[PDB]
């Protein structure tokens, strides 16, 4: 994993989870544009522009986790820490991320995220994503391919 090659513009195209938050705000989520650039500690700054209630921007800081392609993230839409890993990536096409956390014994969710350099997604990729998600205890009702906002991602 060459972190430098993973900088620049990405589109979030796939999301698979079992979190409470996702189990509800699911239908409401669209594809977001995420620009990746270095963080202070040698990690990654993720600046995303997304559609929320018909246009917003937030920055998430991925702190380095001791090995290349491994990171941690603080409290997103919930209040926990996330262990993020790059399952597989082609810096010119896509990246399959896996995030895991736990609010405590018997309280552990998983989140699979598929980022893409383009807004269109090839079936082969959808399948890879489908497969990974199903190996991690997620089913179809968990897997969602984010809609292309006809707005808050180009402008």
Curated annotation (Swiss-Prot):
* Chain positions carrying an annotated carbohydrate: 18, 45
Single GO BP term? negative regulation of male germ cell proliferation
UniProt catalytic activity: prostaglandin H2 = prostaglandin D2
Task: List the active site.
Answer: 32
Q: Which cysteines are joined by disulfide bonds?
A: 55-152
Q: Describe the disruption phenotype.
A: Mutant mice show decreased susceptibility to passive cutaneous anaphylaxis associated with decreased mast cell degranulation.
Keywords assigned? Cytoplasm, Disulfide bond, Endoplasmic reticulum, Fatty acid biosynthesis, Fatty acid metabolism, Glycoprotein, Golgi apparatus, Isomerase, Lipid biosynthesis, Lipid metabolism, Mast cell degranulation, Membrane, Nucleus, Prostaglandin biosynthesis, Prostaglandin metabolism, Pyrrolidone carboxylic acid, Secreted, Signal, Transport
Tissues/organs with expression: Abundant in the brain and CNS, where it is expressed in tissues of the blood-brain barrier and secreted into the cerebro-spinal fluid. In the male reproductive system, it is expressed in the testis, efferent ducts and epididymis, and is secreted into the seminal fluid. In the eye, it is expressed in the pigmented epithelium of the retina and the nonpigmented epithelium of the ciliary body, and secreted into the aqueous humor. Low levels detected in various tissue fluids such as serum, normal urine, ascitic fluid and tear fluid.
User: Do you know what upregulates this one?
Assistant: By IL-1 beta and thyroid hormone. Probably induced by dexamethasone, dihydrotestosterone, progesterone, retinoic acid and retinal. Repressed by the Notch-Hes signaling pathway.
- Gene Ontology MF term list: fatty acid binding; prostaglandin-D synthase activity; retinoid binding
Q: Kindly state one GO CC term assigned in the UniProt record.
A: extracellular space
The EC number(s) attached to this protein equal 5.3.99.2
UniProt subcellular location: Rough endoplasmic reticulum; Nucleus membrane; Golgi apparatus; Cytoplasm, Perinuclear region
The consequence of residue 48 to A is: Slightly reduced enzyme activity. half. Reduces enzyme activity tenfold
Q: Report the protein's function.
A: Catalyzes the conversion of PGH2 to PGD2, a prostaglandin involved in smooth muscle contraction/relaxation and a potent inhibitor of platelet aggregation. Involved in a variety of CNS functions, such as sedation, NREM sleep and PGE2-induced allodynia, and may have an anti-apoptotic role in oligodendrocytes. Binds small non-substrate lipophilic molecules, including biliverdin, bilirubin, retinal, retinoic acid and thyroid hormone, and may act as a scavenger for harmful hydrophobic molecules and as a secretory retinoid and thyroid hormone transporter.
Let me see what the UniProt entry remarks about domains. Forms a beta-barrel structure that accommodates hydrophobic ligands in its interior.
Oligomer and partners: Monomer.
Similarity annotation: Belongs to the calycin superfamily. Lipocalin family.
Protein's UniProt name: Prostaglandin-H2 D-isomerase
Originating species? Mus musculus (Mouse)
């Amino acid at each position: 994993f060459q972190q430098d090659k993973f900088l620049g513009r990405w589109y979030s195209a796939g999301l698979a989870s079992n979190s409470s938050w996702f189990r509800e705000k699911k239908a409401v989520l669209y594809m977001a544009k995420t620009v990746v650039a270095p963080s202070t500690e040698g990690g990654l700054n993720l600046t995303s522009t997304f559609l929320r209630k018909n246009c917003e921007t937030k920055i998430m800081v991925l702190q380095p986790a001791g090995a290349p392609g491994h990171y941690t993230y603080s409290s997103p839409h919930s209040g926990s820490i996330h262990s993020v890993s790059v399952v597989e990536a082609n810096y010119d096409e896509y990246a399959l991320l896996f995030s895991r956390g736990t609010k405590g014994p018997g309280q552990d969710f998983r989140m699979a995220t598929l980022y893409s350099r383009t807004q269109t997604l090839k079936d082969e990729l959808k399948e890879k994503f489908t497969t990974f998600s199903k190996a991690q205890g997620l089913t179809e009702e968990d897997i969602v391919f984010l809609p292309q906002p006809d707005k808050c991602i180009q402008e």
